Each structure stands twice: as structure tokens, then as C-alpha cells.
Amino acid sequence: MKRNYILGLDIGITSVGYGIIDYETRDVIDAGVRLFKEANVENNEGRRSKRGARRLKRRRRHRIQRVKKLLFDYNLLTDHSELSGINPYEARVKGLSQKLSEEEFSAALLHLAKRRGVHNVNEVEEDTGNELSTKEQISRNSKALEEKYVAELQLERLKKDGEVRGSINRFKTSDYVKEAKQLLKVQKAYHQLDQSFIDTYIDLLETRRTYYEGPGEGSPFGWKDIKEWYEMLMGHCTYFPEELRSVKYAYNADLYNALNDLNNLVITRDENEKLEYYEKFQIIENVFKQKKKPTLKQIAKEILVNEEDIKGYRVTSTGKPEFTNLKVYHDIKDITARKEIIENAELLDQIAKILTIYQSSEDIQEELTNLNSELTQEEIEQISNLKGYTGTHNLSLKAINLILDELWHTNDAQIAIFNALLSQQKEIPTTLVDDFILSPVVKRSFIQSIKVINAIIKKYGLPNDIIIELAREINRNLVDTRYATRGLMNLLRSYFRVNNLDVKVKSINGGFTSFLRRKWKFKKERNKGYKHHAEDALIIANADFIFKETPHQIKHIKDFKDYKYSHRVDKKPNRKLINDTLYSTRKDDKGNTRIVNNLNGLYDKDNDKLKKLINKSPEKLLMYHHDPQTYQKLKLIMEQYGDEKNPLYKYYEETGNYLTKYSKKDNGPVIKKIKYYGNKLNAHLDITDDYPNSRNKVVKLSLKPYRFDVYLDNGVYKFVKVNNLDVIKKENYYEVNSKCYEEAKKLKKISNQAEFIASFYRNDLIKINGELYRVIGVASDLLNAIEVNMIDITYREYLENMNDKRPPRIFKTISSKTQSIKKYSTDILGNLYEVKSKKHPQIIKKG
RNA sequence: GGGAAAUUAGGUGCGCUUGGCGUUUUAGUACUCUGGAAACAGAAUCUACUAAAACAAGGCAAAAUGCCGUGUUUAUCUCGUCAACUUGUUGGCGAGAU
DNA sequence: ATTTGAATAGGCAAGCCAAGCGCACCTAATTTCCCGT
DNA sequence: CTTGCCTATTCAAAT
Ligand SMILES: [Mg+2]
């Protein structure tokens, strides 16, 4: 409306506060908070890490299947071949001397390809008894294999230590290939197999993709070839967008940086203080092309002037004068000093590019040979083994080759030479943040902040001033100096400037607000609720009044009530579906399926889990039923060393021997985990068909919710949970599964004559028996409970300020007792609306 | 006061390539029980090792260093319009209401 | 008068860590340059 | 740290 105002903003990690104030009177108009989930780097790190893991497991499986096909082709494996009881460590060690059977031979080759070592680990030759260090383990093993093969060492441990697998099982692929070559050398005699077989098999075994190949064809994450790969990555020029930067060590790029140094030099001479063309020419030719690292003495001699006269040079942290080093010139000169080659800039830029862009020597050699030069194959092979070619210059070659003559002649700054030689928008576009790169956290707070400003400009018209305060991860250091804060205000100032809108964007320092709170006696406390973020914003906005022209104004701020909250609602499909862990099940005495649990860490000083379990519930142990003799043997220990936390710890401490299974001759194995009956099985995902002939049931737990759809059925409120498992990707859209959905309604006994009321997503707003909350989820589908939270404060904090000691969670049962359920919604500003729903639930979701 | 480049040292993010593990099932062997002079047969499925297989539910693809599946964006409803495939819904744009 | 069912309180558990690579951007120190308060 | 979901405990209503 007509009235003119200021807009405060308190940008935060989870929140954007906003405050709006009359420009004349400084009375509060409005104020509110927009709350969101902190954008944690952990989240995407998770997504990426798991995508990596899925490819590793896919590639192992596909390598095993490529081996099998080769064994089918050379008629060593069939559909009806018994590989079942063939110890491959025996077969590996046997087949390095004697004839294997086709089955033993197939067993062995398949065992090698499954598990084939590292390829990128060099010796450290150090041992500080670190179990988890790959480098230290790889080295300890390298020593063990001086005289023997991996399978020899592996069979030795199987027999001495009783086991092979684990942390000590870390070997180099080259150690495995040495074995395979020997195995195939012996076996070639007795089996019909040829050099094609042997070459093929070792390729399968040793080969893997490189970091600069990346995925195969289909991938959204892939790329066609190395240049595409590098082009995608590298940055763009400042003065000529749509041109990729130069590589750091191109001849013209280093020569550019060389000239700027010399142009900066100031000398106390009778003639001109700055260097002349001829002087610069002879300095470059005699110093920068002769000496690898120019020194001030060597420059001083060429001029024929004392060192102290020359001033205005780059200085190392130590104190030495620093001058640019021509990398490529020297690198190639050192290989071959032919004037045809090393006095040709265009070639020396090409060689540099190739050396930066290509990664392996054998790729560089081809790319140089295709370059069609006067270089010899001997020279090319030396070039291809050069190091340290990375990175980019800030300018493109286009930009450098433009101004190289001006730097040669005039003693000018680069900026001076380049100096010499949004309007269609209605609202602030949110893509502009994406242009410049930020912390994932901050990028989210900012996208929200622009969406919040847009919504105010719409509702109230343009502000006179906008003011900003970011959260920190009488004095005049108020203008905030952080890359993000600068970035934001540059975005905004640009926008208003272009579209010709008189708006004064500003900022103030994080600390400053706190000072005014102390000054005007206004205690900050998260205790109260989310309102603190908003009443930060209103303070910021009143600092604007102080930076133009008090009890009464701050009385308005402090006594103000009509705050507004806008929690963001997540509707994204295909989030995490379920928890990773797998659980076995068992039917107990009463005929109840139960999850099986495990007690690990039995021999730890402060672990009372088993002692608690034995005293409470001895019948929950599976060995209570199944190994009674070992049970009685364990009970005598618990009675012996009752007084301590962990009776078994004393058993290990005093005698120096882990607890073994009962046996007549004292040769039962150690006990290291104990299985016992845990919770009853209700809500689960059944994965038992992945395990053919599993006796019991194999399950996963924590079905994670997508939404719940409320229905009103003959005066009774009811609801369905829709799981994320119930939602399925099609071509360009997700679909809620119809069969799962009608099944779900049937377990809930929801009639065909029942009216759909609403769908509730996470953070959707719900009014239950006249009380408004935000939705968290479905506590129990079966019992018909939904977890909610409060709006203005977390229920945890509501109980703390009360000093109440209940559980800090709200659960609400939806039942015949429930009288009304209504859905509400807020705009981004927190204006609240009772909202209408469609006639049916949503099935398609294009976003 | 703001912006820019170079050098050295560290950090952050996106992406890629690997390795040993871990969870779980089936089998074998050891441990237990029963029978047998013994080999061994059966019972038990508990404790341990080894192999093979699965590991967000799934979806493609078809001999292939094969590919995707946990991130980001995300108040609601109506009308107009363009589009989409699911053929009456849900996306973009615009307008309105809540 | 005792037993059965609802509601509230109480509590448990959730995959991991080591090796390598590209590019981008930030900070700090030092020197120089270009615009202006 | 939060959330999905089970167990156990306490009080009121029905046989
Ligand atoms: Mg705040």
C-alpha cells in the first residue's frame, strides 16, 4: 500500500526473519519467520557416497559374470557343474604346481576375480601398529610375500590363525596377477586354453576405469571423452565469456605474467624510471630464457645498474625477490634446445594444453603425434613424462594474445589496456544466487531470503531501505565483510539499479544487534521460541532509524504480538525409503515372530548388557534353548564375578582366555557374539525372496513416510499412511501405487462411500479438535497415531521453560473420539489460510 | 573505502575411480546329541571359520572397462492458456480467491 | 469386586573407513595495479 | 539429533 516502509532481515542457518516498519513513525507494521531444515553437506555427501558404493558392487558382479562367460566359452564351466565344496585357497595353492580339475580351476579363477587388491598404493615402509592403515598393512604384507604367493600366505593363516578374511587381507593387485600368471602357466598344459584365454582373463582381473573415464554410456553423470570432461570442468574468461580460460603454464600465459612483473619495476636512473621495449626484450631473452629462476642480481646486470636502484617487485614471505618462471620453455629446452621448437610460441601453447588436459602418458603421446610437429618420437616420449601441468590462468588465450603487444611496448597495467580497448524482470530471479558458488547451507538461506523479499515487495510495494544481518557461522566495523554477504548485496544492488527502482540495500555486523539489545535492555533467549529471529529483524530495521535521525519505539517492538511463522513443507518423492540393516527373525515359544538381536563386545570393561540380560531374561538367549551346556558354563562365570559390571572381562583378565563353547575335549570355538530374542515383528519390509530357502524371515525396518491421507467415514475420522515405498518412478513422473493404496484402505476399513478430507506432508499444518500443529509423521499406522509439533516453539522448549519433565514429543490419536480435522496452509510470509482440497488424492507427481 | 592479478601455504564444494570390511541367507566343516567296534547315518541350528549369493524397494539393458535409484528446487484451491502422458489428470505461464 | 482395553510414559536404535584423482571457489601473508571516500 | 515404532505401566469401564 501507499505507506512507505523499511525491511529488516535476520538471515540465519535455519531461518529468515523479516520485519516491516513505517518509514515515518517507526511503528511495527508486520513481522514473521520462515523456518526450514538446515542444508547439511552430510546429505548430498551421503547420496554421492552411496552412488559410488552401488557402482563398486555392480562392477564386481559384472566382472564375476564376465569371467564365467569366458569359462563357458572354453568349456570349463557348465549349467550343471558342482563348485560348492571346493576350498579355493587349497585350489589356488595346489594349482601353482599340480593339475586342477575343471571345477577346482573354475573355483580358483572365480575366487581371484572376486577379490583382486588395490592398484594405487605405494610402499610407506613404516610400522606404527596401525590396524586400519591400508598403507601400513599393504607394506606389512609385501614383506610377508618376499618368497611366497598371496594364496600361500592366505592358506598359512587359515591353518595357523584359523581365519583369512579381515583387515589383514589387504594386498596389491600386482601380487594377485603374479599368482594368476603362474596358475595359468601350470594349468595351460593340462587344460585346453590358449594365449587369448590368458590375455583375456588377466585383463578382467587387473582392469578398472580411471577417474577421467568415469561411467559408461547411459550415465547422466558421464562424458564422451577427455576434452569434453575437461571443458565441462574448467572456468571461463573474465573479458571474453564463452571462451575457456588459458591453462596456467602456456608460454603466452607465463610470458604475460613475466611482462607484468617487469612493467611494475621502478628504477632510479638518469633516463626513464620505467623499462623500455628494448630493455624488456633483452631481459626476457637473456635472463628468463637462460635462467630457470631469475634473480634481481641477474636482471640488474642486464640493465647494468645497482640492485638497490630497482624497487617495486613481488617478494616471497621469507624476503627474497620473486620473478615469474617460464615453465614450458625450460621444460622443453632441457629435453631439446632446437630453435625451430623452443622459439615457437604457438607450439609451446599447444604442448602445454595437451600436457594439462591429457592425463596418461600413452594418451599424451598419441595427441602429440597427431599435432603434426617437427618433434621426433624420442623427444615426444620425453615430453609425455613431464609433471606439474595443472590449473588455469584467469584469462583466455584470446584475451592474452589481444594485449600482449601493449604490455610489450607501453608500461601499462592490464586493467588499463582492457579498459581502453535483467531489465525484462518483474521479480528478483532466484537463479542469480546459483551463478556464484557458496556453502550448501548458505545457498539455501539465501534462496529463501530472495523468495521472502519478493513476497513483501508484492504485498506492500517497494521498500525505501532493505537491511541484512547474516548469522555468525560505538565501534565502526559495521559493514559486514564476508564473501556471501558481499555476494548477496551485489546481487540485490545490481537488480534494483538495472530496473530503476530507488531501493537502498545495506548491511550491519552480526555483533552489532547484540549491542543494541544490551543497550535497550532486551534479553535474547531461544527459550521464548522462534519469535527471537523476528524480533532481531525489527531491531535491525530500527537501527536504520538511528542511522537517519528510545523507550517508546522499543516498547512497540517488545510488546508486539502478531508474529507469523511459515514452516517449509517437503513433498519430494524418492527420499530414503528404509533403514539399511538386515534382521533375521524367529518364532518363540508362544508362536510370536521376533527380530533376532546380537550382543557384541562381550569382553569390554564397562559393558553390562549380558549380565543384565541373564538376570532379567535368561530365556531370551537362543543358546538357553539350543546349547544348554554352554549356557550353564556361562552362568558359572556370571556367578563367579558377579560384583563387576562385566563378569566376562574378569574372566579374560584373570585367566587370559576367551569363553569357549562347551566341548568334551576342550576344543569348542570362542564365543564372540550372542544372539537373543528381541522385539515382536509388526511394521517391516520383507526381503526374504533374495535369500532362496531361508527358513525364517529376512526383514528391514523403519518404513519412512511420504504422507498420510485423512478420510471421513460415517462420522469417523480415519487415515492411510502412504510409504515412500508406495511411490514409484515412471518415465518423467512418480506414481503412488494403486494396489498398495487400496490394500492400505482395506486394513483401515475405509469404505467406498468415505469422503477424502486432505493429504498431510511433513510440516503441513493440521487443526485437530480446534488446536493447530505441524505434522511430523505417523507414529503408529496400526494404532492410528500421528506425531505433531508446536508452531511458535518446539515442544521440547515449551516443556523446558515450564520446567516440566514429560517426554518432549506430542502424539495424537485419530479415532471415533476425534471431532474435526482441518488442513491449514501459510504463504512464505506466514499468513495463515484454511485451505481447500481436491476431490481425490494425488496419484501423479511430475515434480 | 571498493575491485583485480601473481606467488606461497591451507581450507571448502561438485564430480569421478578403487579397496578391505559390516549386515543376512544357503551350504560345508568344526562344536553338541543319538546310534554304531569303526567308517559313517540321523537329530539339533546353537557357537566358529570358509565359500557362494543379496544389501536402500525397484527399474533399464542384453556378452558390455554396460546404466539409473537416499541431493537440490517444493503453501493450497479455482479459472484461462500452453503442454505432458497417465486421456482426465498435473506441470509451466497468467489471473483470482483462500 | 476383578479383569480387560485405552492412553500415556519410557526407551531403543539408526552401515564403515581407508586409498587416489580432476575442476571450481574461499581465506591468510606479500607485492603491484585499477576505481573513488 | 530426530524419528519410527515397540514395550510396559497405570487407570477406568465392563462382565
Ligand atoms: Mg536469528
Cα separation of A491 and A489, whole Å? 5
**Which nucleotide has the least CA–C1' distance to A794?**
D2
Q: How far is CA A662 from CA A599, A665, A668, A827, in A?
A: 19, 9, 6, 69
Cα separation of A804 and A796, whole Å? 10
Protein A86 CA to nucleic acid B51 C1', in Å?
8
Cβ contact A457 with chain B strand, < 7 A: no
Helix axes A483-499, A440-460, angle to 10 degrees: 30
A622: helix, strand or coil: helix
Say which amino acid occupies A634.
L
Cα separation of A208 and A173, whole Å? 11
**In this structure, what C-alpha cell is assigned to residue A290?**
637462460
Lateral strand order in the sheet of A821-826: A810-813, A785-789, A771-780, A765-768, A821-826, A832-834
Cα separation of A24 and A28, whole Å? 11
Is the CA virtual torsion A521, A525, A528, A533 positive or negative? positive
Cα separation of A734 and A120, whole Å? 42
Cα separation of A721 and A704, whole Å? 10
Cβ contact A779 with chain D strand, < 7 A: yes
**In this structure, what C-alpha cell is assigned to residue A391?**
590449473
- Ligand 1 centroid distance, CA of A846 (Å): 35
* Backbone interruptions in chain A following residues (C to N > 2.5 Å): 421, 473, 549
Q: How far is CA A112 from CA A106, A578, A801, in A?
A: 10, 34, 64
Strands (E), A23-171: 28-35
Burial class (CB in 10 A: 0-12, 13-18, 19+), A647: buried
Strands (E), A273-376: 310-311, 314-315, 321-322
Backbone phi, psi, residue A202, to 5°:
-65, -35
A617: helix, strand or coil: coil
Contact A785, A812 (CB under 8 A): yes
Q: Please, what is the end-to-end C-alpha distance for chain A in angstroms?
A: 35
In sequence order, what are the residues at sequence separation of 6 or more whose Cβ sits closer than 8 angstroms to the Cβ of residue A391? A247, A248, A249, A356
Strand A583-587, strand A564-567: pairing:
unpaired
Q: Is A535 annotated as a binding residue?
A: no
Contact A750, A743 (CB under 8 A): no
- Ligand 1 centroid distance, CA of A446 (Å): 14
Cα separation of A104 and A560, whole Å? 83
Which one, of A202, A234, A506, A253, lies nearest residue A399 by Cα? A253
**In this structure, what C-alpha cell is assigned to residue A687?**
526381503
What are the beta bridge partners of residue A22?
A5
Burial class (CB in 10 A: 0-12, 13-18, 19+), A602: buried
Q: Which residue has the cell 595359468?
A: A184
In order, the DSSP letters of A41-88 are: HHHHHHHHHHHHHHHHHHHHHHHHHHHHHHHHHTTS--TT---TT--H
Q: Is A552 annotated as a binding residue?
A: no
What are the beta bridge partners of residue A118?
A172
Cα separation of A105 and A86, whole Å? 10
Cα separation of A633 and A650, whole Å? 15
Contact A44, A503 (CB under 8 A): no
Contact A179, A149 (CB under 8 A): yes
**In this structure, what C-alpha cell is assigned to residue A129?**
601398529
A369: left (phi over 0), alpha (psi -120 to 50) or beta: alpha
Cα separation of A291 and A175, whole Å? 45
Cα separation of A298 and A286, whole Å? 9
Strands (E), A442-510: 465-466, 504-505
CB count within 10 Å of CB A740 equals 15
Contact A325, A314 (CB under 8 A): no
Q: Which residue has the cell 595346489?
A: A94
Contact A67, A76 (CB under 8 A): no
Contact A471, A69 (CB under 8 A): no
CB count within 10 Å of CB A415 equals 8
Which one, of A788, A756, A794, A793, lies nearest residue A771 by Cα? A788
A721: helix, strand or coil: strand
Say which amino acid occupies A75.
N
Q: How far is CA A417 from CA A266, A275, A284, A399, A411, in A?
A: 20, 18, 21, 11, 10
**In this structure, what C-alpha cell is assigned to residue A564?**
507469523
Which one, of A448, A467, A454, A453, lies nearest residue A426 by Cα? A454
A822: helix, strand or coil: strand
Q: Which residue has the cell 554352554?
A: A630
- Ligand 1 centroid distance, CA of A510 (Å): 10
Backbone phi, psi, residue A230, to 5°:
-75, -40
Q: How far is CA A220 from CA A224, A230, A294, A730, in A?
A: 11, 16, 48, 17
Contact A433, A446 (CB under 8 A): yes
A216: helix, strand or coil: coil
* Resolution of the PDB structure in angstroms: 2.8
The answer to whether A764 is a known catalytic residue is no
**Which nucleotide has the least CA–C1' distance to A785?**
D5
What are the beta bridge partners of residue A630?
none
Cα separation of A778 and A811, whole Å? 9
Q: Among chain A residues 653 through 682, which have CB within 7 angstroms of nucleic chain B?
A: 661-665, 667-675
A34: helix, strand or coil: strand
In sequence order, what are the residues at sequence separation of 6 or more whose Cβ sits closer than 8 angstroms to the Cβ of residue A119? A172, A173, A174, A206, A208
Q: How far is CA A632 from CA A601, A614, A638, A661, A813, in A?
A: 20, 11, 10, 11, 47
CB count within 10 Å of CB A308 equals 9
Cα separation of A41 and A28, whole Å? 37
Enter the DSSP assignment of A118: B
In sequence order, what are the residues at sequence separation of 6 or more whose Cβ sits closer than 8 angstroms to the Cβ of residue A91? A100, A104, A105, A107, A108, A111
Cα separation of A478 and A508, whole Å? 5
Rg of chain A in Å (alpha carbons): 37
Contact A776, A762 (CB under 8 A): yes
Burial class (CB in 10 A: 0-12, 13-18, 19+), A378: exposed
Using a 7 Å cut-off to protein CB atoms, list the covered nucleotides of chain C.
7-11, 13-27, 29-35
**Which nucleotide has the least CA–C1' distance to A394?**
B5
Q: How many residues does chain A have?
A: 847
Cα separation of A539 and A285, whole Å? 65
**In this structure, what C-alpha cell is assigned to residue A727?**
511411490
Cα separation of A407 and A422, whole Å? 36
Enter the DSSP assignment of A242: S
Enter the DSSP assignment of A179: H
Is the CA virtual torsion A490, A492, A495, A500 positive or negative? negative
Q: How many CA atoms lie within 13 A of A720 on its CB side?
A: 28
Is the CA virtual torsion A230, A235, A241, A244 positive or negative? negative
Cα separation of A511 and A517, whole Å? 10
**Which nucleotide has the least CA–C1' distance to A56?**
B18
What is the SS3 string spanning A244-292? Answer: ECCECCCHHHHHHHHHHHHHHCEECCCCCCCCCHHHHHHHHHHHHCCCC
In order, the DSSP letters of A390-458 are: --B-SS-HHHHHHHHHHHHHS---HHHHHHH--TT-SS--THHHHHS---HHHHHHHHHHHHHHHHHHH
Backbone phi, psi, residue A826, to 5°:
-120, 145
**In this structure, what C-alpha cell is assigned to residue A780?**
503408529
What are the beta bridge partners of residue A722?
A707
Q: Which residue has the cell 496400526?
A: A782
Which one, of A756, A585, A805, lies nearest residue A685 by Cα? A585
- Ligand 1 centroid distance, CA of A479 (Å): 18
Q: Which residue has the cell 614471505?
A: A317
**In this structure, what C-alpha cell is assigned to residue A743?**
490394500
Cα separation of A780 and A237, whole Å? 57
What experimental approach yielded this model? cryo-EM
- Calculate the CA A337 to chain-centre distance: 48
What is the SS3 string spanning A750-790? Answer: CCCCCEEEEEECECCEEEECCEEEEEEEEEECCCCEEEEEC
Which one, of A367, A359, A357, lies nearest residue A385 by Cα? A359
Contact A417, A400 (CB under 8 A): no
Q: How many CA atoms lie within 13 A of A805 on its CB side?
A: 0
Which one, of A377, A769, A794, lies nearest residue A565 by Cα? A794
